[model samples]
Target chain A: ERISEQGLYAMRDVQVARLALFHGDPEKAKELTNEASALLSDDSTEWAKFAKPGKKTNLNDDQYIVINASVGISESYVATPEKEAAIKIANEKMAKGDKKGAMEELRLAGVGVMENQYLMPLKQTRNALADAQKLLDKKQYYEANLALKGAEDGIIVDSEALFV
Target chain B: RISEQGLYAMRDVQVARLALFHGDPEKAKELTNEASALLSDDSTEWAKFAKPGKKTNLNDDQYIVINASVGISESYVATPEKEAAIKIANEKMAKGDKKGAMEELRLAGVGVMENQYLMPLKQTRNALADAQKLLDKKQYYEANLALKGAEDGIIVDSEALFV
Candidate 1:
C-alpha cells in the first residue's frame, strides 16, 4: 500500500505538472515535476528493474507500483520536450506569416498530448484539432490559429483538475 | 451490537453526504433510510437522522444531523461552511452565473479539504486554484469540471477512511 500510495502521488504530480505547463506556468510545472522525480527516485531500483523488458513482476508487488510511476515519469519527460519543440516550431512558422505551416506544427506538437492517465484530455485535444482543420479548410486562418491555441490551452486546463 | 449499529449508520450517513454533494438527492435519501433503520427511534442518533420537527433553521438542522452521525463534535463538522457555499452556488447556478457558482463550489471544495484526515489538502488546494483560474477565464464548464476533480478526491479519500 505504501509503494502504491507513493507511486500514485508521483503520477499525480506529473499530471499536475503537465497541466501547469499547459497553463504556461513553467516554474510551477518544474516544481511539480521535481517533486514527482523525488518520489520516483525513492524507489529508483524497483523502477529500473520494472523498466527492463522481459523482467517479470508481481501484480501486487512494489515493482508494479514503481513501474506505474516510471511510466508517468517517462511520458512526462518525452511529452514535455516534444511539446516544447512543437510549440517552438509553430511560433517560428507563425512569425514567418506561414499560418498554414504554423497550424500544421501545432498539430504535430499536439501528438504527444495523447491519453494522459490522470486526465483524458485526448478527446478535447482531438476535437480542437478537428475544429482547427475545418477552420483552416474554410480559409479562416486567424480563427484556425486561435482554435489551435485553444486546443493546447484546453488540455492544460483540463489536466489541472486531475491533481487531487 | 449498538456500537456496531452506530458504525453502520455513520457509514451510510457519510455515503449519503457524498451523494448529496454529487447532486443525487434520491440516492442520498435512499442511503439515509438505510442508516435510519440501524438507529433507535428515541436515541439522539435517530433525532439526527429524522428531519427537524418544527425548526426551519436548515443549517443548524443539517449541522446536528451530520455531527451526530459522524460521531464528532460540532467543531469537527465543517458542514455549515460547506452547505453555505453550496447554497450560494446553487443560487448562482440558478441565476446563470456560472463563474459565481464555480467560486462557491471551490469554497465548498476547500471546506472538504480542511478535513485532512479525509482528503489530501495540498492536491485539493492545487485543483481549487486551477479551477478558480479557469473560472476567471470564463471557462465555465472546465471550471466546474475542475471543481469535481477536487470533490472526487475528497470522496475517494473519505471512502477509504470509512472502509
Candidate 2:
C-alpha cells in the first residue's frame, strides 16, 4: 500500500526539477534530470500491475497500490441491448437446440470488450523529460514545453483510483 | 487524454479534503503540497472494463455484456463533439433508448472516444490551489468548498441498462 522507495526517490528528482523550472532555474532543473537519469540507469522491465473490473466497486486486492505517474485509465460500461435478455435469448435458442441462433444473440446484444491496461510510460517518459531538460538548457522554451507536455501526457492518469 | 499532473492535483485535494474531515489539517496541507509538487513547475496534462469478447459457450448460457460508458477528450477540453455526445446521450438514455445511447457514445468521436470520469482539470486545479491557501490560514470552510468543486465537477458517464 506504499510507494516503493526507489519510486519515492525518483519522484523527488521530478519534483525538484519541476520546482526549478517554476523558479526559472533551468540549470537546477537540468541538473535534477541528470540525477534522475542516473538514478534509473540500472532499471528496465519494471512495470505497474493492473486488474480488470468485475463489479462497480470493491476493487480486487490484486490491484497494485499506485502513485503519481503510474496511474492509468480503467472504467466500466453499460451493457447495451439489455445483456441478460440477450443471454436468455441465446439460451432459448440453445434450448430449442438451434446453436447458431444461440450464438447470434450475443452479437445482437452489443456486448463490448472489457478494458484493461497499465499505461505508464516510465522509461519513454523519462526519455521525454530528458529531452525537456536538454531543450530547457539550450533555452528552447517552446520545444521544452512540448517535450514536457508529451512526457506528462504519455502517462495515463486515473483520477478515481489516485484520489481514493 | 488528461494530464498526469492534473489528476495528481485532483487526488491531492481529495485526500486533503479527507484529512480535513478527520481533524488532520496538517495532513490535509501536506497532501496539498504533494499535489503542488506535480503542477506547472512540474507539469500538467489531460486527459475500463469487461470480458465480453472472451469466448463463452452458447449452451453455457453465459454471455458477456460489455457496455460503453463513453465520451472523448483531447487535453481534457470539452469540445462540441464531446458536448453533443453528452447532450444526445442524455436524451437517449432518459428515453430508455439503450441502443441509441450506446451508438451515440461511439458515434460522436471517431474510433472509441475517451470517457473520462473527471472534468475541468484546470478549474479543479485552480480550486486545489485556493484550497491549499485557505488550509494555510486554517480556513477549513473555504478549503472544504474548494474540495466540493472536485466532487461537483466529476462526470460519471453511465447510462442505466436497468440491470
Candidate 3:
C-alpha cells in the first residue's frame, strides 16, 4: 500500500517537473519523466509503457479534453473544420509571419480546451514546459519535449521560444 | 507439547509421592517423609488421574527395586507369581508362631522368584518390611504392605525418584 502511494506521488512529481521546464526553469526540468519510471533504473526495458502522455485530468464536467483540443478552431485561423486544422493554420500563419492570426487561433483553441473554470490542466501545462528544459539539460531532449507536449495537451507554451 | 510433557511429568511425580507415603518412613526418616503429602496438595488432581487400578506403563521389561527391611525371611524370589504367593504365605504364617515354617516357605518362594539366586529378593523383602513398619507409624500399614507386595513391575524408582 505504501509502495503504491509512492508510485502515484512519483508520477505527480514528474507532472511538477514537466510544468517547471515548460514555464522556463530549464535547469529544473525533468530529464526523464514517465509514469511508473520510479520503478525502473539504468536497465529499464520497454520504457514506452511508462510514457507520460500530457493530457491531464479533465477540467470540464460536460466536455472531454481531447475532444475539445481536437474541435475548437475555425477556418480563418486554421485551414480545416476542427482544432487540428486551426493549429495547422496557425503554424502556417506563424511560418508566413502572420503572428496575430496564429495567436488569435491558438487563444481560441486554448479557450476551447479550458471549457471549465478548473485550472489544474493549465497549471500542469506550465509545469511541463519547465520539465522540457530540465530534460534538455540531461540530454534527454526527446523525452523532455514529449512530457512538455503532454503537459501542453498540444498547446504551444511560448510560440516565440519554440521558434527560437 | 510442553503442556503434555508437563502434565505427564506431574503424574509420575504423584505416583512417587503415593509410593513413598505407603512405604511409610519412620518418624526419624525425615528426608522423604512429607514428600508424598507435599505433592498431594499441589498435584492432587493429576494424582487422581494416576490412581490405583488405572494402568499406565505397567508392561514387561518393567524394573523392580527390592527393599530389604520388609523381608520376613531369606528367599530367592524370581517370577512375579512365586513372589506374590510366598508373601501371602508369610503374612498368614507371621500371624502365628510358625516362624520357622514361614522362613522355609519364604526361602522356597524367593528361590524360584530369584531363579535360585538368593541375593535380590532377600534384600528387597527386608527393605520392604522396614518401609511397612514406617507405614504402620503413619497408620498406612495396610497400604504400605500392599506396596511391598505389588512392587514387582511397579517399584518405578525412575518416576519415584525423579519426576
Candidate 4:
C-alpha cells in the first residue's frame, strides 16, 4: 500500500548489474537488466530514463558505457600503487579466465577511484552491482533469476544499457 | 587479499537496509550490513575503521547510513500501495504473535510487493525473516538460526533507525 515493492525490486536489479559486472558476468548482467526491465513498474523507473534510450530495454549499453566510464574515471582518482595493483590484478585475473574475479578486483577499484571525486550514485551503483553478483552466484538458476529481477526493478527506469 | 569482496559486501549491506527500512526488521538488516562490510580483505581492520565511537557496534554503520538513505530516497520516489499493505502485514507479523496467520499474510504481502517492483532482495529478506520466525515459533531454533545466518549475510551492515 505504501512501499512500492517494485522500487525495492528495481534496486535489487541494479544490484544484479553490479554483481554481474563485478563477478565477470557482464552478459548475465545484461540479461538480468533485460529481464528486470520487463518486470519494472513505469512509476518506479529512474536510471533507465536517464540513459540514451530512456527505457529498461535500453539500459544494457548505458550500463556498459557507465561502467567503462567509471573504470576510466576511477583510474585517475585512485592512488598510484593501489590503482596499478588493481590493474595488474584485473589483467592477471582476465588472463587466467577469472574475468569475474577481475571485475571483483575492479569493483574495489573505487577505493582508489573514490579518492578522485567520483559521483556518489556511480560509486554506489558500482558497489551495488558487485554485491548483487555474489548473491546471484550463491543461488541456483531460479534463485539467481529472482535476485536479478529485484535488481532490475530499481535501475531499469534510468539505465541506458537496456536497449543495447 | 586485494579483492573487492569487502566493497561488494558493503553494497550487499546497503541492499539489506533497503530491505529493512521499507518496513523490515532493524536487527536483521544490521547483521547483513556487518557481514557485507567484512566481506573484504582486511575486513576486520576496515570494519574497525568504519565503526563510529560508541555507535551501534554492528560494524557496518556507514553502509547502513548509505543504504538507509538510498532506501529513503527510493521510497519517496516509488511508494507503491501494494508495498504499503505488505509492510503493514510484516509489522503485524514481527510483533511475534501472528502465528499461522503470518505465513499466508506475508506471502500475500510478498505477492503484492513483487508486482512491477524488482526488489527480490527485499522479498528475499522478508521471506527469509518470515520463514525463520515461523521456524523459531515452531521451536525449530537451530534450523531457523541457519536460515537467519543466510539472510543476515545479505545485509550485515544496516541500521534500525538513524543514529
Candidate 5:
C-alpha cells in the first residue's frame, strides 16, 4: 500500500502550509499549498456497469401476484492495497482536523463499485405463515409465534465481503 | 434441485469470473479447480480442505457447506400450457383424483419453481482455462472477452424450477 513519494510530500507540504497558516506566514502557506496541489491527481467517481438482473421474469400468470422486491448495495469503496493505505491516511488526516486533506487522500484512492440482488421468496415464508395460522387456529400460540418469527428470518439477504 | 456442490459451483464461477474482470487472473485461475471439482456429483472430489478442529466461513476463506437452495428463476399461471394443465388438473380433482391433480400440476410445473439451472460449471471452467492462456500472452481484451464469453454461457442455463 504505497502512494508516490510526491503524494507523501504533498501530504507533508499541506501540513507545513497548515503550520504557516497558524503562524501568519501567508506567502509561505500559499507557495506550499500550490506545490501540494500540483503534486496531487484528482479522482472522479466512476464505475463499470457490473450486472443487471439479466433474467426478465415473465409475470403474466393470472393467478399470481409478483412482488417487485429487490435488495441493493450502496456505492461502497472497493479496497485496493494503495486505497487501503490511502484510507488510513484519510482517517488520520480527519482525526487531525484535516478534512480537505483526508478527502484528497480518499480521491486518490479511487472509487468503488456497488452490486445488488433481488429476492422473491418461494414457499418458505408462505408455508410458515400458513403453518402459523393453522397453528393459531389450533391454539398452539407459542409454536405459531416461533413460526411467525422465522418468517422474517426467511427474508434475510445473502451478502459478500468487501475487505476479504 | 441441484446438489449443494452444484450450488457451490455456481458461487465459485460467479466470483471466479469477476476476478478475471478485475485483472487477477492468477486467483481467477485458482478458483476454477475448486469450481470444476465441486460441479461433479462426486462428493469426495469436492471435500473441504479443512483441518479437523478448524472452523471455516467467508471471513476465513473456509467454504465448507452442505445444503440446497431454491433458485426459482420464473413461474406463472398465465401461459397457454399452464392454463391447459390447470384445466386438466381441475377436471381430475372433480373425479377425486388428488394425486392425479397434483401430477398434472407437477407436469405443468406450477406453484413454486425449484429451478435447476445447468449452472454452467464446465462452461465457465473451460473459458477460464482459455482466459489463463490468453492472459499468459497478455491478450488482455481477449482474456476479458473469453471470460465474458463464459459468463454469457453462465447465463445460458435453460433449466426450469420444481413445483
Candidate 6:
C-alpha cells in the first residue's frame, strides 16, 4: 500500500504539471514533473518493497516503481516539443496583436499534453465530485468540500490542459 | 487478567491501522487482540479507548477486538467505493467529457475518506474544506497539497484512536 501510495503521489504531480503547462506556466510544470520523477525514483527504496503476509502481490514493487517513473518521464518528453511549437505560434500571434489567437495557440498546444497523460486528471476529477456529493449528503461538509476541491482543481488543471 | 498498560496497548492499535491500510486485516486483527489483552484490566482506560456506544459489558480487551473488526470492515467498504468512482471517471473520459471525468476522480478520493471512523476528525475535515476552497480559486498545486493534508490527518487520527 505504501508503494501504491507513492505511485499515487507521483501521478498527482504529473497531473498537476500537465495543468501548469496548459495554463502557460511551463516553469511550474517542469518543476512538478521533476518532483514526480524524484518520487517515482524513490520506488526503489527498501521501505517501498516491504510487504507482509496475505497481502496480494500480483506485481512486485520494482515493476510498479519503474512503470510509473518511465510513464511520467515519457509523457514529459513528448509534451516538451509540442509545447515549444505552440509557444512559437502563440508568440507570433502576440507579435501581430492577436491576443486571442495567441491564447488559442497555447490551448491547442495543451492538447498534446492531454494526449500524453491520457486524460487521467479528468477521471480523477469526476471521482472527486461524486465523493463530495456523498459527503454532503452525510453532512460531512468539510470533507465534501475537500473532495469537491480535488475535483475542481482536477478540472481546472485538465481544462487548461485541454483548452487553456 | 493482566493489568492494562495504556501506552503499549495504544501502540498496538496504531500499528493495527497501518496493517489494515496495507491490506493485512488478519495482521490488524491480531494486533488489536494483543492490544485488548494489554488493556483488559483497567476499566477506566477502557472507557477512554472505547468509541461512542462501544463502552459496554465486554472487557476492554474484547472491545479492542470489536474496534479492530470495525476498522477492517470500513477499509473493505472504502476500497470498493474508490474503485467504482475510478471506473465511472474512466467511462466519462472515454466519452470525451473531460470535466465530468475529473469530477469522478475527486469522488474517488472522497470515497477513500468515507470511513465512519474518519468522519469525526474535525481537523481533517477542516483541511479538506480548505483544500476545496483552494481548488475553487484555481490553485491546483496548493489544492493537491491541501487534499493530502486532509488524508494525512485521517491516517494520524485513526491510528491515534487505536493507541
Model 4 chain B: ten consecutive residues of lowest lDDT: B111-120
Q: Looking at model 5 chain B, which ten-residue stretch has the lowest summed lDDT?
A: B50-59
Clashing pairs in 5: A61-B78, B114-B161, B114-B162, B115-B161
Cα error of candidate 3 at position B29, Å: 99
Q: What ranking emerges by TM-score with the best candidate at the front?
A: 2, 5, 4, 6, 1, 3
Superposition TM-score, candidate 5 onto the true structure: 0.28
Per-candidate DockQ values are: 0.01, 0.02, 0.00, 0.01, 0.04, 0.02
> All candidates' lDDT scores?
0.40, 0.49, 0.34, 0.36, 0.45, 0.40
**Model 5 segments beyond 4 Å from truth?**
A1-164, B21-23, B36-110, B120-124, B155-163
Candidate 1 C-alpha lDDT tens digits along B106-163: 4343211111112222333344455445545655445445545444432110100111
Q: Candidate 4 has what TM-score?
A: 0.22
Model 4 ranges with Cα > 4 A deviation: A1-76, A100-164, B1-96, B106-163
Please provide TM-scores, in order, for all candidate models, with all chains considered together: 0.19, 0.32, 0.16, 0.22, 0.28, 0.20
lDDT accuracy of residue A112 in candidate 6 = 20
Q: How would you class the docking of model 6?
A: incorrect
Q: Over the stretch B1-163, how does candidate 3's per-residue lDDT look in tens digits?
A: 0123223322433353365656534332332333233322444333322323212121111112212111121112135775666676677667764554344453342211111101122222333344435455664544344333323212211110000
**Error of model 5, residue A125, in angstroms:** 25
- The residue ranges of model 3 lying beyond 4 angstroms of the native Cα positions read A1-3, A31-143, A148-164, B1-163
What value does the lDDT take at residue A98 in candidate 1?
A: 88
Candidate 2 whole-model C-alpha lDDT, 0 to 1:
0.49
Quote the positional error of residue A51 for candidate 3 in Å: 17
- Evaluated on CA atoms against the true complex, candidate 6 attains a DockQ of 0.02
Best by DockQ: 5
Candidate 2's clash total is 13
